[PDB]
Amino acid sequence: MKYAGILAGGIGSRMGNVPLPKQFLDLDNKPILIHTLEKFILINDFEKIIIATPQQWMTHTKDTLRKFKISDERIEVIQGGSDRNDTIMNIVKHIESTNGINDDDVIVTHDAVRPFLTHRIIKENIQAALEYGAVDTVIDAIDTIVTSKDNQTIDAIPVRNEMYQGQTPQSFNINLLKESYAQLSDEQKSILSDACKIIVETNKPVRLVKGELYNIKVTTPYDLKVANAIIRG
Amino acid sequence: MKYAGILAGGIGSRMGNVPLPKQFLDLDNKPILIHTLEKFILINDFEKIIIATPQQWMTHTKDTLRKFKISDERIEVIQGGSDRNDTIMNIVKHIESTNGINDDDVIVTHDAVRPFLTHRIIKENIQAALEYGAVDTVIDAIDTIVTSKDNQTIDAIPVRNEMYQGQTPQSFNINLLKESYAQLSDEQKSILSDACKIIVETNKPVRLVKGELYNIKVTTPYDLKVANAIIRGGIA
Ligand SMILES: Nc1ccn([C@@H]2O[C@H](COP(=O)(O)OP(=O)(O)OC[C@@H](O)[C@@H](O)[C@@H](O)CO)[C@@H](O)[C@H]2O)c(=O)n1
């Protein structure tokens, strides 16, 4: 079975790491979250489309689904976790308690504020997860990537041809993801913020699926202004 | 003395069509290169502002400057090189053969196809080059960065808080740039995608100056749609 996990944990402020509900901001007279969900409802192969969000946003999420006539029976809103990977695991646990996890199940996890992913991206994610167990959506780096350990000076400049900008979806065989996450120590769980890095850190391969330049994360006022252009055109 | 080097030397190859150089494409009825140049003209302290273009585009560039009533005597259009760092060094050599290089000279090198840099970015680049000798214009990485050695599977996912997207300008003390570049082999030069790595590879510091989310590089039709939005929105 194939599941979608829509991660609506918000976008943390720079000071304080306060979750801001950017997925509710308006994009051409409809919340960003609704645009993203519409893309997933178009995929008939999903058994459930699970939105995980902080307890304090669950009612507004349900109210917004109702206002924008999103009635698809596969949509469910559940409470998120203490960080992004813990929220993913809340989704996995919800699947297990509801249907039970099958050996061939896959989960397609995706940012609520990435409304411009495509049918191809979703299908390629599903197929790569079924065959290989773990997948990241990426695009080739356009800028030269540089590192710094002090926010003052360059530490290194890697070869750009080996660098990729990570997007989402990130998709996994569910049992593989669960087994890998179970291998991490409490310290690792506190430090890891990315879902594909769970797999990498536990020495299993992660496949690349190529995204799109326009599959942006709408997290700043600048990105919201750009998003209006992408949508209208 | 302070010099600007506007890098307009690439050629936009297209499959099955006449090459259309991205730096000359119209953006709100004005070529991208002119948008970029206007920012540099507003900096009084440049001694010269040198635009490098492919040989066959030099006359067209000079004429287009005249078309937009741009007569600034500091502007010179010269021939670029076969790769980006060769274009930068063509500009350095032109300065050397024209004025000679002073020990305190700095050069602000910048993509012609990045029209949305700001007064602040240029001024911080100049000051950074004067104080530290080498500087990169960067922003915090917008995405998690992923690496791959086989172009099929992830090799590593570095700690995201140490990752930055390189933009331009990149600015240098001229003698430092020249001396560092002279140390590199042809293979080392082949691997470079920017100028600041010349400095990093020769074990001299490169300082960071913050760019902007809208200091985008215009190279594909998608980027031009974004550029048009930026202009109409007053974002930059
Ligand atoms: N023979 C050449 C080739 C290119 N050029 C100029 O170079 C500009 C960017 O060129 P291009 O769009 O192809 O981008 P690159 O792949 O070179 O990488 C750049 C990336 O490193 C940098 O922006 C940033 O990230 C660093 O921090 C364009 O104006 C070209 O005309 C030149 O004058 N002569």
Curated annotation (Swiss-Prot), chain A:
InterPro entries: IspD/TarI (IPR034683), IspD/TarI_cytidylyltransf_bact (IPR050088), ISPD_synthase_CS (IPR018294), Nucleotide-diphossugar_trans (IPR029044), TarI (IPR034709)
Site note Positions ribitol 5-phosphate for the nucleophilic attack, residues: 160, 217
The entry's keywords: Cell wall biogenesis/degradation, Nucleotidyltransferase, Teichoic acid biosynthesis, Transferase
Pfam families according to UniProt: IspD
Domain of life the protein comes from: Bacteria
Entry EC no(s): 2.7.7.40
Record has Nucleotide-binding as a keyword: no
Self-association state and partner proteins as the record states: Heterodimer together with TarJ.
HAMAP family cross-referenced by the UniProt entry: TarI (MF_02068)
Protein name per UniProt: Ribitol-5-phosphate cytidylyltransferase 1
Gene: tarI
